[PDB]
Amino acid sequence: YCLTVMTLVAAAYTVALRYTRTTAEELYFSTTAVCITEVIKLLISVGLLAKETGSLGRFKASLSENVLGSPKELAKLSVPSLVYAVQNNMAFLALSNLDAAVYQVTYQLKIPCTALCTVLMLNRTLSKLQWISVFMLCGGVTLVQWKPAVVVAQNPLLGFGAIAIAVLCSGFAGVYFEKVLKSSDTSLWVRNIQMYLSGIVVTLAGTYLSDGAEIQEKGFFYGYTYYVWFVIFLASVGGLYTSVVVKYTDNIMKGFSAAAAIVLSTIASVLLFGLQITLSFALGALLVCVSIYLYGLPR
Template identity: 55%
Template sequence: MAEGASVVFKLYCLAVLTVMAASYTVLMRYTRTVEGVRYYSTTTVFVTECAKMFFTLCILLKEHKGSIRKVSQELKGNIVGKPMEMLKMSVPSIVYAIQNNMTFIGLSNLDAATYQVTYQMKIPCTALLSVMMLGRSLSSMQWIAVFVLTGGVILVQGIGGEAVSHTTGTEGNYVVGLTALTIAVFCSGFAGVYFEKLLKGSDTSLWVRNVQMYSWGMLSAFLGVVMHDYQNVRENGFLYGYTPLVWLVVLLGSGGGIYTSIVVKYTDNIMKGFAAAAAIVLSTIASIMFMGLVVGWMFVMGASLVIAAIFLYGLPKTNTEKLPVRKSGT
């Protein structure tokens, strides 16, 4: 992929991510709340990590014109040859694995409205961490845009989420759900910004970074299965409850993850947050069209705020592919 990507390419990546994240959220919630056999979410997180590793290896193979020898040389040099770099990548990877599991716990224990409103704290949290950890600076207009976006998404979810929860009838432990989700918010911000710091702070390619990350991801997700669902998996099998829709969740989760990494490389974590917010507006519109969701003025107001925030923040014109130079050490 070309360095110094054009605005059109960045917008394309943000748009694909928006559509993928929107479908992923709708489908994940549907498969977790629909009546019937409940699959083990820890296994889905693991299978998704494996799928991401598979896709990343395919991309690396394509970049090396099908030469398995060249791919293994590159990976050997970066995995066996650079143990410290490999170790550094364990941090975002393990934190993401915690986040992915916490999201499922939050989703299974909270009503959609509470879930979505709490989860939106990711946006200011990520912005703050980007400033603190990457030395990025936001203009006052951009800070305003961040908060307008958060408010807009909360309004959209306040109405949309509540209506969806009535149709799904989720019952769960509120405190467990809220705690899990608060952890997920911090994990999302921290892991995203840390990954960006490692990616943009060195010359190692995105795909090698992803292989490093997904190796840890597979390991930690596997530990998640063993610690949480060992007995269940022994009794019913690893792929218990995997309907075609669950496989689609895996596909969207892995595709979405890979697009997330592309978006972080060519734009940044804050812009990823804007794409995710647009995804929420889109997924609510999809629920209106396909699930009979009825929305009122709060949705219209929220959606307008989201659109306004996107323009206030500015299109991805600024070059965020490199980290700003800091006066003191990184």
């Protein structure tokens, strides 16, 4: 379920976002959407904490001791929420200035950056063979994702600067969260709550600084339609399900699993719905399979 959710969210999110940034008459503030995602992800996570603890007495006790009463953990988790506030704003900026396929292939440069950050920050080791598989995975998804390289005027060079920042944020913020998540027995849903508390403050401050002038003229929830709330739900679910992947695997295996699921989803579409496929897909799919094989070998 959590692999078929991640693909159908991955498919739906970037297309629905790209649509809502280009086609609107009354256009919404992207900074607010990033902030509202952190609010919803907090409220779902608070819900999940009650379900995990499985008791009102245990839930309340967890909020006191672990959520609100672990200040140094909130201090640590304020760092990646500041970086994710950058990242997610750069993602709305990138999809406003570049094509959906162009964003997709370019943003996979996070996979090398995330692998480097994993080796740097978590003090792990990747062999020469494992490094070969990471770049081969990156080249494999490039071949699978490839598509030709809006009703509004755009700026590609500003769009690529945004993906350059967002790629660096993806590696740093994700691995920082993994570092803090796996440093104790504290629950995933506490760590998410601890993070999204600071996130809501940082993202709301971002909105003030970026769009506060224009928001006074128009309103905070200006341009919001049924499709903007759809995008934010997908961003919230995706955000939560990403933290679950990092919990049960790691920030490198997030990339391999994401790539493997794109190939499995396209193969499911060929068999069930008679989808026509390219030779680039066939070659790229094999590279994704070899990369998983090479990464999955003992040294």
